[PDB]
PDB file of C-alpha atoms in Angstrom:
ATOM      1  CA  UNK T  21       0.000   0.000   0.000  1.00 13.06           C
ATOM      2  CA  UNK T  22       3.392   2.222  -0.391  1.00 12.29           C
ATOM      3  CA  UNK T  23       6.456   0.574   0.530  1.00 11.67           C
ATOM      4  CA  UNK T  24       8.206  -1.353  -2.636  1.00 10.79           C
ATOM      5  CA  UNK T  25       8.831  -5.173  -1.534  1.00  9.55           C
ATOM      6  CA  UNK T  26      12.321  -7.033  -1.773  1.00  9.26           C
ATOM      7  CA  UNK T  27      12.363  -9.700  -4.338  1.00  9.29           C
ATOM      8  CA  UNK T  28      15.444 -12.322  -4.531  1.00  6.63           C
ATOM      9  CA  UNK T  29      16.406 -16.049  -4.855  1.00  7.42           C
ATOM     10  CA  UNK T  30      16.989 -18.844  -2.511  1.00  6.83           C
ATOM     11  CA  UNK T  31      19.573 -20.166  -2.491  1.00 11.48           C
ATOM     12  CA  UNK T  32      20.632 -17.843  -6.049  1.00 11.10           C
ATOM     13  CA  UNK T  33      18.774 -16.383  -8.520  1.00 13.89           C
ATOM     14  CA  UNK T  34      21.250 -18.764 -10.970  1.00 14.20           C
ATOM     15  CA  UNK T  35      20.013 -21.982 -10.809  1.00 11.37           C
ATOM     16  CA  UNK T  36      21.155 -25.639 -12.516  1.00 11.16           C
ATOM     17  CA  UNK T  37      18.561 -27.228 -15.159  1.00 12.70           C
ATOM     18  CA  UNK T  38      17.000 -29.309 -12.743  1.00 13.96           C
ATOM     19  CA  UNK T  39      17.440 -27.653  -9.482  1.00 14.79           C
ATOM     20  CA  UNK T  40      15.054 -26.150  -6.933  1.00 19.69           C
ATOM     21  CA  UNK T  41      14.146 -22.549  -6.461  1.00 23.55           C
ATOM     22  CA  UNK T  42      12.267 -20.091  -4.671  1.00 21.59           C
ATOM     23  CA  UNK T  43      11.852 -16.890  -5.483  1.00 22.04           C
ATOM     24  CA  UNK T  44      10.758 -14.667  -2.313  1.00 23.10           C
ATOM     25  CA  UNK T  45       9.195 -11.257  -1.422  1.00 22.85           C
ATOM     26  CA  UNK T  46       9.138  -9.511   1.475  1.00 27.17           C
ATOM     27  CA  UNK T  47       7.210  -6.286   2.400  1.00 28.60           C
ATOM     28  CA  UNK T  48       2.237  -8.412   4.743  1.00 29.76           C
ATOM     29  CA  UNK T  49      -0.082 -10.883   2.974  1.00 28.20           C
ATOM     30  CA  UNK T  50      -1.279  -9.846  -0.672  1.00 27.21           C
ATOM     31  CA  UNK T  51       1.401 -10.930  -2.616  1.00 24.98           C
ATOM     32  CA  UNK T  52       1.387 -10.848  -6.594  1.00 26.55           C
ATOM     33  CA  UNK T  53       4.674 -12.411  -8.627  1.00 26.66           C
ATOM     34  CA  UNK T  54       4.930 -12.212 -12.157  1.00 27.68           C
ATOM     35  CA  UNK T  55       7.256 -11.865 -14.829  1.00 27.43           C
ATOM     36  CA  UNK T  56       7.739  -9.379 -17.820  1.00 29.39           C
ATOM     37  CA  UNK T  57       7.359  -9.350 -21.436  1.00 31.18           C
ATOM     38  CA  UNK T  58       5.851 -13.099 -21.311  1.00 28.55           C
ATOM     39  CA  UNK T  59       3.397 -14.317 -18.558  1.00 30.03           C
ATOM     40  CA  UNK T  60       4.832 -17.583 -16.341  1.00 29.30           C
ATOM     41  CA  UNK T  61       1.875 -19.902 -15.412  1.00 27.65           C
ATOM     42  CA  UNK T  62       4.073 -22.231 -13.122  1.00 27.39           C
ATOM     43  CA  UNK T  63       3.281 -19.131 -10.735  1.00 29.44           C
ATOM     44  CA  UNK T  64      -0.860 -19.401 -10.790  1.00 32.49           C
ATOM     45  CA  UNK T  65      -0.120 -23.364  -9.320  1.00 33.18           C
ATOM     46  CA  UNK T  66       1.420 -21.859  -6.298  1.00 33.85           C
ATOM     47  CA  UNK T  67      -0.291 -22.677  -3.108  1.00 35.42           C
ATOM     48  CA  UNK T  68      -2.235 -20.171  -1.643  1.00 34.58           C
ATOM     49  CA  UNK T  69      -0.620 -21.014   1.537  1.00 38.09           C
ATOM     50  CA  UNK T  70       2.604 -20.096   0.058  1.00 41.57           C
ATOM     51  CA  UNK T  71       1.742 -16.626  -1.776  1.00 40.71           C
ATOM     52  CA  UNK T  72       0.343 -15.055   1.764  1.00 38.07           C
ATOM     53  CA  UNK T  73       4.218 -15.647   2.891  1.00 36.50           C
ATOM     54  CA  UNK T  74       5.810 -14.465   0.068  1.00 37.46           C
ATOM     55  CA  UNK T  75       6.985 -17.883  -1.263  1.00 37.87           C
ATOM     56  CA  UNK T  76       6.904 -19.241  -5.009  1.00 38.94           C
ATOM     57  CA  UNK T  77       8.742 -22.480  -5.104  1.00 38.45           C
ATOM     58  CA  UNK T  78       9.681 -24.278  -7.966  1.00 40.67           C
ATOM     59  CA  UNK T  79      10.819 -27.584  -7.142  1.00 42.23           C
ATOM     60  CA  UNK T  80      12.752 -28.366 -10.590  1.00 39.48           C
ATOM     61  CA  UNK T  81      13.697 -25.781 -12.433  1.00 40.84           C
ATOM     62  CA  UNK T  82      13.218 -25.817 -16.495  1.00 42.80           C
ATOM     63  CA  UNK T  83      14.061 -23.585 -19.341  1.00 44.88           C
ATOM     64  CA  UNK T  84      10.929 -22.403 -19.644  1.00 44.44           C
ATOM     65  CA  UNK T  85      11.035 -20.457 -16.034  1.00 42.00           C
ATOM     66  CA  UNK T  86      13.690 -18.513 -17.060  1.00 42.25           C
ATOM     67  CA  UNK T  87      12.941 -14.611 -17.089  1.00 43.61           C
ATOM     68  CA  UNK T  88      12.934 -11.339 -15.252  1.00 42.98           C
ATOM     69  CA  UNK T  89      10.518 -11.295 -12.696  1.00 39.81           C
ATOM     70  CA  UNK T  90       8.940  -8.371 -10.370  1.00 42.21           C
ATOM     71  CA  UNK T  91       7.240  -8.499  -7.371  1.00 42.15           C
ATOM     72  CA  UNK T  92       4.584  -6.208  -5.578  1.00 40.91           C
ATOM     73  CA  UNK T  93       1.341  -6.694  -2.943  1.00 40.66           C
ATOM     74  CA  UNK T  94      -2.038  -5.351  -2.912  1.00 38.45           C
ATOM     75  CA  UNK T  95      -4.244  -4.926  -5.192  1.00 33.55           C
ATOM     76  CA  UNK T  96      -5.667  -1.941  -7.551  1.00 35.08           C
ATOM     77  CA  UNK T  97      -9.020  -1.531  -5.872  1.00 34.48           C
ATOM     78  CA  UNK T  98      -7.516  -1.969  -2.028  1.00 36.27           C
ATOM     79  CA  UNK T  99      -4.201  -0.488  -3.414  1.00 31.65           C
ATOM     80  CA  UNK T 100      -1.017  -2.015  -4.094  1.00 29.93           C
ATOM     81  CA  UNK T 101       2.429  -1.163  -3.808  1.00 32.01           C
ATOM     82  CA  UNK T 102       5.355  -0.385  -6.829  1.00 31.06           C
ATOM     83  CA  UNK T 103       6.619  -3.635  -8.258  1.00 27.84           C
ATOM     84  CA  UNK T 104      10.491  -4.940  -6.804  1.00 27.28           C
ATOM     85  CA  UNK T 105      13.544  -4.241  -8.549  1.00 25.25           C
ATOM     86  CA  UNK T 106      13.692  -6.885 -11.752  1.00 24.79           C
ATOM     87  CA  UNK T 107      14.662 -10.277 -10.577  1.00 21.27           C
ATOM     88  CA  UNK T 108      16.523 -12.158 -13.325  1.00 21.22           C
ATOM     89  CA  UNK T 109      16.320 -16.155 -13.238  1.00 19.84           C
ATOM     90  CA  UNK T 110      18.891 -17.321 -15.280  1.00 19.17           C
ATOM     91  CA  UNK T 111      19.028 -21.537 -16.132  1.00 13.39           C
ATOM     92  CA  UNK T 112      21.985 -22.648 -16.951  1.00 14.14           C
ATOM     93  CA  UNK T 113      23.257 -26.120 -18.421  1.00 14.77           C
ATOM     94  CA  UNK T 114      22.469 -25.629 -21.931  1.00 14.89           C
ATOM     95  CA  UNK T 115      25.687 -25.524 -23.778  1.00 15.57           C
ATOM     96  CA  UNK T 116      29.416 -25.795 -22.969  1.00 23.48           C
ATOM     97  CA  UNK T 117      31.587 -25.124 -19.887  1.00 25.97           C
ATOM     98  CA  UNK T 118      33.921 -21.988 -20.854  1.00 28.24           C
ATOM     99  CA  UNK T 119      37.616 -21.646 -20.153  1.00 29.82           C
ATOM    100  CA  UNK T 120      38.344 -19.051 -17.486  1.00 29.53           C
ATOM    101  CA  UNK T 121      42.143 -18.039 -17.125  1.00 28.53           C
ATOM    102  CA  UNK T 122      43.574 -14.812 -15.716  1.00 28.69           C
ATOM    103  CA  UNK T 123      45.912 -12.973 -18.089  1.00 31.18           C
ATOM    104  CA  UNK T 124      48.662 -13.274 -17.652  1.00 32.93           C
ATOM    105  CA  UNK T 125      48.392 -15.503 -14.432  1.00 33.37           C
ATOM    106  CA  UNK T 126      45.919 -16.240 -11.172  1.00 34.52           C
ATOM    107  CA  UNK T 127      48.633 -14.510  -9.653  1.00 30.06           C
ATOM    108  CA  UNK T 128      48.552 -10.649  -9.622  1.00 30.55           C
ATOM    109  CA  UNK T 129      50.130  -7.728  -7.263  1.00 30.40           C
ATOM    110  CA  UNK T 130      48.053  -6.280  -4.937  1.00 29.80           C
ATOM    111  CA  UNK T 131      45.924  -2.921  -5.144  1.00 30.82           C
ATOM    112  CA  UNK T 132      46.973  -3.673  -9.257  1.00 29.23           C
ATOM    113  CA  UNK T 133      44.512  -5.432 -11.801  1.00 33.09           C
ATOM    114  CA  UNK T 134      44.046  -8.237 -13.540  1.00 35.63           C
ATOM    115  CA  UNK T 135      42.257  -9.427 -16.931  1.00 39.12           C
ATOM    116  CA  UNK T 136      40.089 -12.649 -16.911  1.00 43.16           C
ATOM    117  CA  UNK T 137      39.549 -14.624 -20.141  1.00 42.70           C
ATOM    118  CA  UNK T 138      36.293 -16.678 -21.139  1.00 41.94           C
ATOM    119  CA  UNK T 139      37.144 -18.303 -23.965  1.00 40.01           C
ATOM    120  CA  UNK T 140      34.878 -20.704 -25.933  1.00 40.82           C
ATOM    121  CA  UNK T 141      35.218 -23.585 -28.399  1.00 38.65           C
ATOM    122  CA  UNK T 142      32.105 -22.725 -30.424  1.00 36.95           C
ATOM    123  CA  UNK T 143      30.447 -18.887 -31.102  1.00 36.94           C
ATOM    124  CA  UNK T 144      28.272 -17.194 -28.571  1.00 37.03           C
ATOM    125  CA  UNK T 145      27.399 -13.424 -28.563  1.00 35.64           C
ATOM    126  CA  UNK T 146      27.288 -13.421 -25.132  1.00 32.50           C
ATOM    127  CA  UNK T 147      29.839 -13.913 -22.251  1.00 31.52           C
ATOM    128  CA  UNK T 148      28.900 -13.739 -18.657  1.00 30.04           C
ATOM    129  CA  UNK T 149      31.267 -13.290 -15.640  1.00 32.07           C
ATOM    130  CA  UNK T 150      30.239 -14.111 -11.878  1.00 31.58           C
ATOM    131  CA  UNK T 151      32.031 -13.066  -9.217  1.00 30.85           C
ATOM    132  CA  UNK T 152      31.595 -15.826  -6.722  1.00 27.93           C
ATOM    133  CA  UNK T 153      27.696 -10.822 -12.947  1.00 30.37           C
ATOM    134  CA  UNK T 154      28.514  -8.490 -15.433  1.00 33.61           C
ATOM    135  CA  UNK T 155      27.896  -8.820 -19.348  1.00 35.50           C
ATOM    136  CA  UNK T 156      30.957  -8.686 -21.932  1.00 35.97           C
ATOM    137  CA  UNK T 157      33.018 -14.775 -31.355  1.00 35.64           C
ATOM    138  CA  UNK T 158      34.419 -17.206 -28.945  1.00 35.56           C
ATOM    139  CA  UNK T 159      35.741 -15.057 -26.656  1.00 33.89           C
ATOM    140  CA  UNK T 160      35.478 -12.367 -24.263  1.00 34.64           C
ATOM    141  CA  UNK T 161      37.806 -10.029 -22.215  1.00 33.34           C
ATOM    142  CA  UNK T 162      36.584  -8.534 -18.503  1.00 28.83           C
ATOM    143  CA  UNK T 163      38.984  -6.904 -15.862  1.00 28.76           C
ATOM    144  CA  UNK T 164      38.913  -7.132 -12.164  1.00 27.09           C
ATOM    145  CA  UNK T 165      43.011  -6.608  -5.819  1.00 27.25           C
ATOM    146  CA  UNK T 166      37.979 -13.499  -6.091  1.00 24.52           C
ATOM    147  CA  UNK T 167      36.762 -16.531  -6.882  1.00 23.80           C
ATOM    148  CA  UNK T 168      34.767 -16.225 -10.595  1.00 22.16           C
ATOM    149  CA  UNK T 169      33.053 -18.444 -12.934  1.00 21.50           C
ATOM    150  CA  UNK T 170      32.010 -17.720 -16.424  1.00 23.85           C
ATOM    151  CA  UNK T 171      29.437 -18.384 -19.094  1.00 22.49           C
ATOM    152  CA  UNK T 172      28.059 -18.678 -22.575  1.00 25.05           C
ATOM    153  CA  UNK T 173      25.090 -17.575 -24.149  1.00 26.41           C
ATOM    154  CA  UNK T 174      23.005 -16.787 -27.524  1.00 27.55           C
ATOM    155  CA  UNK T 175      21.249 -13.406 -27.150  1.00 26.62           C
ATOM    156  CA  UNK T 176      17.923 -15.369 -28.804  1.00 23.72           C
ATOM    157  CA  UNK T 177      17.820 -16.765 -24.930  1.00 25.36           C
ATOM    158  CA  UNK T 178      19.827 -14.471 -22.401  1.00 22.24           C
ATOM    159  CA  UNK T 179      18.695 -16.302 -19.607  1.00 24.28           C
ATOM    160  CA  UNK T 180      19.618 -19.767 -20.516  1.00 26.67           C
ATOM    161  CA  UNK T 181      23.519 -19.793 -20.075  1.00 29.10           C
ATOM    162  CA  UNK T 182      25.676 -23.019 -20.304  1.00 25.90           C
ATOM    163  CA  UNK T 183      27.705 -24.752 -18.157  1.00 28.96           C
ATOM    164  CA  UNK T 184      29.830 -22.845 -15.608  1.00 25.65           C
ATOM    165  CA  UNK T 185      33.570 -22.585 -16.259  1.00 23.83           C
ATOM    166  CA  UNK T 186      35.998 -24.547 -13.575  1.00 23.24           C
ATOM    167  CA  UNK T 187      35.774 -22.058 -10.379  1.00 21.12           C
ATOM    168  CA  UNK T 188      38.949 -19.375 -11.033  1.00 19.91           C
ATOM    169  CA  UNK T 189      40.446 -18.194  -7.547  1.00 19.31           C
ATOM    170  CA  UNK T 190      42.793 -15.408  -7.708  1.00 18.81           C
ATOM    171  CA  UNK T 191      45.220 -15.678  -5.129  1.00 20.07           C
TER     172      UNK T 191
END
């Protein structure tokens, strides 16, 4: 009825093909989830019991839940609240673990910088770094002094990344 409500992931907003999820909201009992551009029906099968407290679980996660999603409570007629900062569940397992190597080595100075290589066998317009994530043929360049992780993706599906890379740990 004023106050925007907190929207995030449990345990990550990243989640394995496969893998369980909820997304949560916190604000007192009118709850609405829902996600942009293209409406999600595995939300209208939550439990009512569930969307009083905020909670949307999805017990195995498919490529089809991928999406930004917003949250907000209330309705129009009693009044409702603005919708939460963009949540954006990303899936990931659809193509082919990275390569993540620091250039020139894991090892770097400190208070200097470093750059951090995702490199790919096969093309993807996309490269994604997490920092155990920010956007960028085969590969892609970013700069961090750290553990991070990588990942590929088509921009026809920017949530759907692939594999992660081996965990990279600067030391």
């Amino acid at each position: 009825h004023l106050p925007k409500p907190t929207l995030w992931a449990e345990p990550g907003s990243v989640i394995t093909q496969g893998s369980p999820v909820t997304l949560r909201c916190q604000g007192t009992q009118e709850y609405r989830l829902y996600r942009e551009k293209k409406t999600a029906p595995w939300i209208t099968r939550i439990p009512q019991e569930l969307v009083k407290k905020g909670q949307f679980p999805i017990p195995s996660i498919t490529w089809e839940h991928a999406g930004r999603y917003r949250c907000y409570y209330g309705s129009d007629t009693a009044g409702r609240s603005e919708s939460s900062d963009p949540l954006e569940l990303v899936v990931t397992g659809a193509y082919i673990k990275p390569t993540l190597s620091a250039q020139p080595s894991p090892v770097v100075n400190s208070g200097g910088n470093v750059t951090l290589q995702c490199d790919s066998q096969v093309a993807f317009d996309g490269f994604i770094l997490c920092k155990e994530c920010l956007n960028s043929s085969s590969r892609a360049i970013f700069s961090v002094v750290w553990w991070y992780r990588c990942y590929a993706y088509d921009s026809n599906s920017p949530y759907e990344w692939s594999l992660p890379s081996d965990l990279l740990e600067l030391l």
